[PDB]
Ligand binder design. Structure first.
Ligand SMILES: CCCCCCCCCCC(=O)OC[C@H](COP(=O)(O)OC[C@H](O)COP(=O)(O)OC[C@@H](COC(=O)CC)OC(=O)CCC)OC(=O)CCCCCCCC
Ligand code: HEM
Ligand code: HEM
Ligand SMILES: COc1c(O)c(C)c(C/C=C(/C)CC/C=C(\C)CC/C=C(/C)CC/C=C(/C)CC/C=C(\C)CCC=C(C)C)c(O)c1OC
Ligand SMILES: COc1c(O)c(C)c(C/C=C(\C)CC/C=C(\C)CC/C=C(\C)CC/C=C(\C)CC/C=C(\C)CCC=C(C)C)c(O)c1OC
Ligand SMILES: CCCCCCCCCCCCCCCCCC(=O)O[C@H](COC(=O)CCCCCC)COP(=O)(O)OCCN
Ligand SMILES: CCCCCCCCCCCCCCCCCC(=O)O[C@H](COC(=O)CCCCCC)COP(=O)(O)OCCN
Lengths: 352, 55, 126, 431, 352, 126, 55
């Protein structure tokens, strides 16, 4: 139960509860997705309709968000109404009703819409394949629910009793008096939760190099490469991702996207090439890999990376990989590769 | 389809007295409505033929 | 027309009174046996009229093994009625089987419709 | 092409083909599922899987032999196949494993494992195979309380009561010398088979089988198995037809060929010369249908089966089909009869002249058991060519016009109307 | 233009034209499938309705069949009507109309039905994966048309002009007088076809070992292995496929299917394990691979294989790999592997 | 009512005759100019009545770029008619643009329906 | 939906004289049919009031 906050002379406040309950901890396929859609449904003492009508008259809204590490519950509101929203977030983690007609009428039709939207984007389905062939169990779990493993209502309640514990969450506030926040948290139902244990592993995750996968798809063609990164190399690959998509690199017109996803134990570098004609995709990805294997000098892009890191970290709690001064070179080694679309006219791994 | 369902005037006849779904357990009290239709025809037809001779 | 919330409010007041539950409860047992729906193989919750939005909500939320058994009892009662007979005596509904299986689903849908109606026609004060 | 029947105490029938590359030798018995009662139903299906069990199949496979078995309503067979130079080893295997010793196959460890495997097959049949189980339910309602109603696989309720003593009691009553025919097909000569049997002194048992007392009888009825969670509707409908040894046997098969079979997703199936296809394709009334003419020792069934996704127009599909059956009495044309003659000859020629000697062994043994001989394909073609339009009109006036029907159905069959609306479509009030 | 036939005292005859025009020669994805559905459509001199009505009164039917090597046109008919069916098959190869309204109304709805039926069988989709990762271009082409590459009407007519040549086909007949068949073929439009060239390659095809692929699917789970076979080893793997599915092997209760597909230049051995519970599939495939790696003696199953080969070859033109007498042993080497279904609970290649 | 196969049989007989094509063809050119459909921006094949199965088959098989242009000419002619005006003279259909674009699709559908009708009512002989 | 489309008697009124799709180019000759409906009402109503005094 870590509590921290920052203050400002600002009209709007934000409160967040971060749970280590993402898809990398899920027991079956898609259980963390279905628990995320159960948040802010009916509570034992208050219906979901009553919660929307009451907070609208005060000027506040609620939202729940899922990624591979976290489930995040958030409220945004006018500043002087803080004790109402501390108690409303505590009742969700403590006494959600989990009615069987709520699963049929609300939760399952909302999760089918999330899956059908993400199914039409070939860039997103290429990223899901790159996580699966790199890590294969923890970080390689599927994010959304599709129904190849059936999940009952008791499976959702067992997963909620596993992740909603006091050693597994942290509370943060923006534009919030910190001494008032610690007093309201200790009086709420968050201190009545079970203690439990933290789910965060300490060791490095197991990874695999030199893998391949091909999927047929009607639409645009995508070629994508992926590299797993350890903790000591996080600064080098952050400079590389900003250098490749800027005007300092001649390859930036051929690359659609490049980024580095970061975790507390390591990360994953990704790169994407997208076009509707697969002869353009095959020509572009062959030039990228051959030029990165000869080597690049990354030191002209250090000051540009320090600006982009500060802009992005204004919403994040700042994992400080801020020593960019030792970054000099890069040469491409072994990597993983996926191809989505017209795979009869796309390269293979040993051809590049 | 059959002609009793495709014609404009016969489909009204078919959906009312031919193919209309009835509950299987109605008794003889549910027959009074069709007797009232026969009574109205009897009163109208005997009314016209008497009106040809009435002052 | 009269809501089941109003019926349960009057009925639970009689059942808690020790003097009113000695007068009305013997009369109610003779009233049900003279009604005769159990001799056609029906429970009382099969007899509730269903052509209204509250009853359509409660029938959707019924578990499917109880929904299959309700459909067989209604069909068997229609066939017995057209033959002008009764069921054999070993196929009658017993009193310990005549339970209100649909009543908790009805009362939950009625309370949600009352709370929605109160929030839609509402006052405020500064 | 010639068959040869010879009796020396044992009836031996052959059909020699010196162009084939395999041979097939077995025994066919003249009892089927219509010789059981409702308490031992499934005892024939258990005897088949005892013969095809793993230890029995392993002894045959080290010699180079393969095993087959088939259960029908009037007969059952047990067949060994081999290369043409080893028909003496296949006739030895039929002697040791099936005639002399049966305490090896009927051990307690082998019987309990076989009974578990059969119970799983019958359970998966009743849950997944919807066209074939509707046709099984059509037999049980048309011939109710009569030996022709029992299913050939048995039921789950009747199979679990069976013990080893039930199988030995069936074998002592039906597996007899006066109920059996030894068959041989493929590349095997007739006098080589009768001298291999006579070089031993084979004999199963002396005596005759029991005689059942109730004869088969058609009853107009219906059975409905409604299941709203299934995506289609499956319906069968039939009248009483012709038995084997009937003088109208080939006329009934030609009448079914007039209406034929259909597949809505095959483009050449949509262009056939059938006048029923004009009504069906206008609003897409079904997915497939097929007409049949089944024959048994005492009775038969003539009708059709169909499968449909258009569940709100089921009544139009039954109405259009039965109005075309009325035309066989009234207004069947000469060009429809000539088309059905050529297609019946192509269908019969493909059934009897396939390249499978196991199929030929089942057809030869079943026909010698009833008639005592086999009709050649050349003589069957001459009976088909002599049928006229007046033969068709006289057959349909007896079997189709104003007659009782039997109906079976499963799935989304709410749109199927009741019995008297369908029964009244068996006549026109025009003629 | 090879012509051969066999005779019999039989009422029914069969005539076939074998074209080297299967999916291993296709220019785009699914063109050989769409040409197969164009056969017996409208001809320049006779409509498709007229062809069905005329041959029904004679007692004959037509059919077209596609596999990975051949397109086969077949007729089955009463014996004395032979010159009508020689001329009808010659008009299909020579003067098919290829109307644009026939593609919209008949050919494309029939090919969509073929694809949707085969899509619901996970055993069939596992076999398509095994061909794609073993050979990758020729034998690895997709069999059916799905529309990830669009195929125009001119693409179909260009493929028909490539495969319907005199050096690329052979004519066969069963229950047919051979001297009459050679006379009717020389008088027909088959001798007016272009000469062209044969498409059959002589060298061994290129193969790959040690590959893997995983597909998510709602239904039963399938695990499958695949081995490419050269021409000198075709007799050993034919005995292995009959031994594994017979009563001579203790593993036959765990195996769903095993076969060997044969071509003129080599073959591919397949094995399948199917169940609705993926814990049964994982236990079964681990026991199969471990027992085949220790070694098996195949000589007790030689006489059983010679019977099964003669039964199967009654419909085939008999590629004679009939020396089973030298087959003694087998030990499993390197192989390919696919997994279809609940892939989170299925093994990986390095775990077995 | 009169089929287009019958109209083309009579019309092609006149056009091959050198004496009949000198008499009727000047009369037909005056008949079309007095009809006045080209001053509303229409071709003749836009005027054919379409509520029959042969015309519905031919309109389905028309290529889509010609189907979009046919829909614009019909809509523009309805708007000009309700204003009781004519089009500007530079927007009139010229004689070299008044081509029978729909006629080959109509004649192909008519021949297929005639062959089907002959095979459905047919005789045989031994 | 609106009450003019959901009621059993008003949907017949709505589909005939309110929401019925007409071609945009019909002229004043297409108005004669509704004048015939007014003429029939005029002949019926003046007919009843004269029949109260007729022998
Ligand atoms: C006024 C001029 C109009 C003339 C026609 C009007 C008829 C009005 C009669 C009232 C009525 O419609 O209800 C009748 C009702 C019986 O209804 P239920 O369906 O339960 O009985 C089916 C039966 O078991 C099988 O009847 P089933 O169909 O088997 O045989 C028919 C029976 C005569 O049926 C009728 O005539 C019906 C009126 O034939 C025989 O009796 C055979 C020996 C000749 O009866 C009752 O519920 C109580 C009986 C007394 C009702 C009299 C009250 C009048 C004020
Ligand atoms: C629902 C329809 C009708 C009912 C209930 C009805 C009722 C009656 C009654 C109760 C009488 C007195 C009979 C008596 O006691 O003598 C009567 C007389 C008469 N009604 Fe009707 N009537 C109906 C329809 C008609 C129609 C449609 C006409 C004319 C076209 C008509 C013409 C006459 C005439 C001429 C008389 C006088 C002759 C007589 O007394 O019978 N009625 N009506
Ligand atoms: C379509 C409806 C009708 C038409 C075309 C029609 C036509 C006529 C005509 C042409 C006359 C002769 C008028 C004259 O020259 O003086 C007449 C007279 C008469 N009609 Fe009608 N009529 C119709 C409806 C009715 C109805 C429904 C009634 C009664 C309920 C009625 C009652 C009379 C009477 C009482 C007379 C005699 C009085 C007179 O001469 O005006 N009419 N009708
Ligand atoms: C093309 O689209 C159109 C369309 O353009 C139009 C205009 C109309 C509308 C035009 C019409 C003509 C419809 C209206 C029909 C009529 C007016 C016919 C009249 C019908 C009757 C049943 C006549 C009976 C009426 C009476 C008033 C008789 C009763 C007399 C009484 C009560 C007086 C006696 C009382 C006493 C006290 C003496 C359409 O319906 C329509 O189709 C969708
Ligand atoms: C629930 O399911 C049901 C159902 O159960 C029932 C019973 C019916 C039964 C239907 C009826 C009983 C019909 C109702 C009866 C009528 C509407 C009768 C209306 C009356 C008339 C049309 C009277 C007209 C009479 C004439 C025009 C005669 C005129 C006299 C003349 C012309 C004399 C001849 C002159 C000379 C000079 C010779 C249903 O329709 C139905 O489906 C909904
Ligand atoms: C005021 C209350 C009004 C209530 C209306 C109730 C309906 C009463 C009708 C009673 C049955 C009448 C049988 C009509 C016979 C079939 C119709 C028909 O033949 O239409 C036509 C031919 O046209 C005619 O000649 C109409 C005859 C006038 C009928 C006047 C009584 C049949 O041809 P068609 O193919 O067009 O039919 C399909 C129509 N959708
Ligand atoms: C076939 C030709 C003959 C048909 C003629 C059709 C035209 C009839 C007259 C139309 C005028 C509209 C009448 C008022 C419409 C409102 C009715 C209503 O509010 O429905 C009822 C009130 O019940 C009544 O009292 C009806 C009285 C009818 C009086 C007519 C003489 C309530 O409305 P409801 O909620 O039921 O609407 C859904 C309907 N399915």
């Amino acid at each position: 139960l870590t509590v921290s906050a920052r203050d400002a002379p600002t009209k709007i406040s934000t409160l967040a509860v971060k749970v280590h309950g993402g898809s990398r901890y899920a027991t079956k396929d898609g259980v963390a997705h279905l628990l995320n859609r159960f948040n802010f449904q009916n509570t034992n003492t208050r219906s979901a309709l009553k919660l929307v009508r009451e907070s609208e008259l005060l000027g506040g809204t609620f939202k729940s968000t899922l990624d591979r590490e976290y489930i995040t519950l958030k409220a945004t509101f006018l500043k002087d109404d803080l004790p109402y929203y501390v108690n409303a977030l505590a009742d969700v983690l403590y006494k959600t009703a989990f009615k069987p007609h709520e699963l049929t009428e609300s939760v399952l039709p909302a999760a089918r819409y999330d899956y059908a939207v993400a199914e039409q984007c070939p860039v997103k389905s290429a990223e899901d394949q790159l996580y699966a062939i790199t890590f294969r169990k923890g970080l390689g779990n599927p994010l959304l629910y599709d129904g190849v493993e059936r999940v009952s209502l008791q499976d959702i309640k067992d997963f909620a009793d596993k992740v909603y514990t006091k050693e597994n969450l942290e509370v943060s506030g923006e534009n919030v008096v910190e001494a008032d926040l610690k007093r309201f948290v200790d009086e709420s139902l968050l201190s009545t939760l079970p203690a439990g244990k933290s789910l965060v592993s300490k060791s490095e995750p197991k990874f695999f190099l030199g893998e391949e996968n091909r999927v047929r798809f009607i639409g645009d063609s995508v070629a994508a490469i992926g590299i797993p990164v350890n903790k000591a190399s996080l600064a080098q690959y952050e400079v590389l991702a900003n250098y490749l998509t800027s005007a300092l690199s001649e390859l930036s017109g051929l690359i659609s996207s490049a980024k580095l996803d970061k975790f507390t134990d390591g990360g994953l570098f990704t790169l994407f090439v997208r076009d509707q004609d697969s002869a353009v995709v095959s020509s572009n990805i062959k030039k990228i890999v051959a030029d990165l294997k000869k080597g690049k000098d990354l030191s002209p892009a250090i000051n540009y990376t320090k600006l982009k890191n500060a802009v992005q970290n204004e919403s994040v709690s700042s994992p400080i990989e801020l020593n960019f001064d030792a970054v000099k070179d890069f040469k491409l080694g072994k990597f993983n590769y996926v191809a989505v679309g017209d795979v009869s006219n796309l390269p293979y791994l040993d051809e590049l | 389809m059959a002609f009793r369902k495709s014609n404009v005037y016969l489909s009204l006849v078919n959906s009312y007295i031919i193919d209309s779904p009835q509950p299987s357990s109605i008794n003889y009290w549910w027959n009074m409505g069709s007797l009232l239709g026969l009574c109205l025809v009897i009163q109208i037809v005997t009314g016209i033929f008497m009106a040809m001779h009435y002052s | 027309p009269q809501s089941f919330t109003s019926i349960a409010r009057i009925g639970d007041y009689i059942l808690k009174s020790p003097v009113l539950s000695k007068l009305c409860v013997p009369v109610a047992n003779q009233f049900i046996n003279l009604a005769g729906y159990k001799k056609l193989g029906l429970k009382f919750d099969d007899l509730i009229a269903e052509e209204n939005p509250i009853m359509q909500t409660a029938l959707r939320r019924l578990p499917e093994d109880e929904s299959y058994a309700r459909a067989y009892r209604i069909i068997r009662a229609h066939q017995t009625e057209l033959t002008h007979h009764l069921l054999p005596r070993n196929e009658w509904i017993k009193a310990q089987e005549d339970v209100p299986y649909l009543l908790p689903y009805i009362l939950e849908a009625e309370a949600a419709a009352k709370e929605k109606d109160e929030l839609d026609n509402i006052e405020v004060s500064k | 092409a010639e068959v040869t029947q010879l009796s020396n105490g044992i009836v031996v029938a052959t059909e020699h083909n010196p162009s084939a590359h395999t041979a097939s030798v077995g025994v066919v018995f003249g009892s089927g599922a219509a010789n059981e009662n409702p308490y031992n139903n499934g005892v024939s299906n258990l005897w088949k899987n005892i013969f095809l069990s793993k230890e029995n199949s392993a002894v045959a496979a080290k010699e180079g032999l393969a095993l087959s078995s088939n259960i029908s309503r009037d007969f059952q067979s047990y067949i060994v196949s081999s290369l043409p130079g080893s028909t003496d080893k296949s006739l030895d295997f039929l002697n040791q494993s099936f005639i002399q010793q049966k305490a090896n196959l009927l051990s307690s460890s082998n019987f309990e494992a076989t009974k578990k495997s059969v119970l799983k097959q019958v359970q998966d049949f009743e849950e997944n195979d919807h066209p074939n189980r509707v046709l099984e339910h059509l037999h049980s309602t048309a011939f109710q309380n009569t030996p022709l109603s029992l299913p050939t696989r048995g039921t789950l309720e009747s199979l679990e009561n069976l013990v080893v003593a039930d199988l030995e009691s069936f074998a002592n009553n039906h597996f007899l010398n006066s109920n059996a025919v030894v068959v041989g097909t493929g590349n095997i000569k007739h006098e080589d088979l009768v001298n291999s049997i006579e070089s031993k002194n084979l004999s199963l048992q002396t005596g005759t089988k029991p005689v059942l007392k109730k004869k088969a009888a058609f009853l107009g009825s219906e059975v409905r198995l409604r299941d709203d969670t299934l995506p289609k509707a499956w319906i069968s409908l039939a009248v009483e037809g012709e038995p084997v040894n009937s003088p109208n046997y080939f006329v009934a098969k030609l009448a079914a060929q007039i209406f034929g079979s259909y597949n809505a997703f095959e483009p050449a199936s949509r262009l056939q010369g059938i006048k029923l296809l004009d009504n069906i394709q206008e609003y897409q009334l079904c997915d497939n249908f097929n007409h049949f003419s089944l024959s048994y020792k005492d009775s038969g069934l003539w009708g059709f089966s169909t499968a449909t996704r258009n569940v709100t127009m089921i009544d139009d599909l039954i109405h259009f089909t039965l109005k075309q059956w009325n035309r066989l009495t009234i207004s069947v044309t000469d060009t429809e009869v000539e088309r059905a003659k050529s297609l019946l000859k192509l269908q019969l020629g493909q059934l009897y002249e396939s390249g499978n000697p196991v199929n030929d062994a089942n057809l030869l043994g079943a026909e010698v058991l009833i008639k005592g001989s086999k009709l050649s394909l050349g003589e069957a073609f001459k009976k088909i060519d002599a049928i006229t339009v007046k033969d068709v009109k006289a057959w349909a006036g007896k079997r189709l016009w104003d007659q009782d029907i039997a109906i079976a159905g499963t799935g989304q069959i709410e749109g199927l109307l009741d019995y008297m609306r369908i029964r009244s479509d068996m006549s026109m009030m025009r003629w």
